[PDB]
Design a protein around this ligand. Sequence first.
Ligand SMILES: O=C(Nc1ccc(Br)cc1)Nc1cccc(C(=O)O)c1
Ligand SMILES: O=C(Nc1ccc(Br)cc1)Nc1cccc(C(=O)O)c1
Ligand SMILES: *Cc1c(COP(=O)(O)O)cnc(C)c1O
Ligand SMILES: *Cc1c(COP(=O)(O)O)cnc(C)c1O
Lengths: 280, 291
Amino acid sequence: RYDSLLQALGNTPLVGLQRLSPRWDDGRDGPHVRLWAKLEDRNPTGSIKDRPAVRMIEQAEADGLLRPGATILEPTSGNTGISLAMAARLKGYRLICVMPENTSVERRQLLELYGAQIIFAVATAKELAATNPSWVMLYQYGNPANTDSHYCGTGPELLADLPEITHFVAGLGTTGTLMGTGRFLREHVANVKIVAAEPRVPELYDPEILTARYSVGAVDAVRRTRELVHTEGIFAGISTGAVLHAALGVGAGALAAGERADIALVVADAGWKYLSTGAY
Amino acid sequence: ARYDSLLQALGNTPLVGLQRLSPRWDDGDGPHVRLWAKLEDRNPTGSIKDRPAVRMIEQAEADGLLRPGATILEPTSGNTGISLAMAARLKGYRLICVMPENTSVERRQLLELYGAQIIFSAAEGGSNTAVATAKELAATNPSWVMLYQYGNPANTDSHYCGTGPELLADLPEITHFVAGLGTTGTLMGTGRFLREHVANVKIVAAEPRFVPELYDPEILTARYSVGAVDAVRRTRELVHTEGIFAGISTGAVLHAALGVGAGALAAGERADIALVVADAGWKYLSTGAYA
Ligand SMILES: O=C(Nc1ccc(Br)cc1)Nc1cccc(C(=O)O)c1
Ligand SMILES: O=C(Nc1ccc(Br)cc1)Nc1cccc(C(=O)O)c1
Ligand SMILES: *Cc1c(COP(=O)(O)O)cnc(C)c1O
Ligand SMILES: *Cc1c(COP(=O)(O)O)cnc(C)c1O
């Protein structure tokens, strides 16, 4: 038990996708090729972003860059702003997000609910921060604490739950998830594969880390999200579907090569905020 | 630990202290009065109903009453439908939900996504009408299996064997348990396990301003009615002060738990009060309650 919602963060579960795996059981036909989904919607605000956000705020607090009542500014497409907004409420900070306008209304309403101000993006944010040296722009595209939240949280957990791991599949945006988790995994698990999926350059990006990079179209992503919820029950956001497409490629490949695989993949958030789009 | 199936990643939900919101968080001018939030939005479909939906099916499975291909029928205000819709996809069953039209669009959406048939019963009569409609649909077509959540003891048992033990493990110093009073499973099963293990424990109900066959009034200390308006206000207050983005029934439980908390404070008595967050705010956004 916890004294704050902020502590009820991480230690997310890992779930075997038996129905969707290319081959769950070892058989006379070859070794298993299993997909394991890690449910990051199970964090305080519904997404993996609670990890880096919280750690970024705590990290600047400790660096002495924040004082109560202070204004925090972050460019975000939604999830980090929501995470940050939650944390700024409890800690007594103001939040301003710089966001693209083609975003789902659900994001707006949660930002508003948490008391965030929205300006309808990195460049914009950078300009405003230059204009207001009072403000703190944690900057998820370059803040080492993004990568650390994953090196120190996601990665270790994944290793603890899946020591037989062969591949890790995540989305590539700020790149924190793959740089943190991936470097930790490569530092502990020999010949481990680190696989991005991106839509068809931050400062956190390390080119040495990725093993693979699938580009995934929007139609494939949506299609795959639906398959996931039809077949495993998992009500995931759309990034998960791009991720899952790239997991089925690696899987198909392990199946064809008769090699054993256990393929951890990230469910970065749930479908809730994507409903308005009518992709579900 | 890991799970071979989403069906297993269920229960063992977190319990978090509400420091800002508890009347008196520090035991120092009075003993403390503490609110503890058990977060049942941490469940496969984001609701406490995962506990009972799963256990009803499995227990039906056991008793011989189900074998896939089979079609389940259930009346629901949404949460139970969703749980059952998810569990029915994995187990190879078809689902019909009877649900009133007043319900939020988000519930409809999810139900269809999981691919349940939904008969929207008329708003007039609420759940009585959703239930009566299912009984009549059951009466045509006896092959459809109605688990019946208002009377299936696998509902009360899911909380007796899960929710309760989990509470007692995390908050052994517990003095009250507050939860909404719907099918009555949560309060009956959690309340029965706790009365057995914790002497003097208070079981407190919240209900909105027919009697389910699960309902044993012996288990309850007190029934608090709560208006929608107070529920919305307390739900909003919960996010503003503790960051917890809860559903509206959680506001009603919060409103009732502060009553009890306020009671303990004013009499200088220690209270450690556990309240259920039955679901998150996601399915309530279209209502406008969060604007
Ligand atoms: O990169 C993604 N999502 C994503 C979607 C599809 C694919 Br394919 C890969 C990643 N999200 C993201 C990236 C950078 C910042 C934020 C943010 O929430 O502020 C989110
Ligand atoms: O009783 C509630 N919610 C509720 C709302 C306000 C108050 Br006060 C107490 C409970 N939900 C409920 C009850 C019975 C069945 C279902 C269902 O999801 O089918 C939901
Ligand atoms: C942030 C995010 C990603 C990408 O994670 P990064 O660590 O930023 O690369 C993918 N999907 C969702 C839903 C996200 O919020
Ligand atoms: C079911 C439910 C309740 C009440 O619980 P019962 O165990 O049915 O009495 C309260 N709130 C929500 C959101 C629910 O789905």
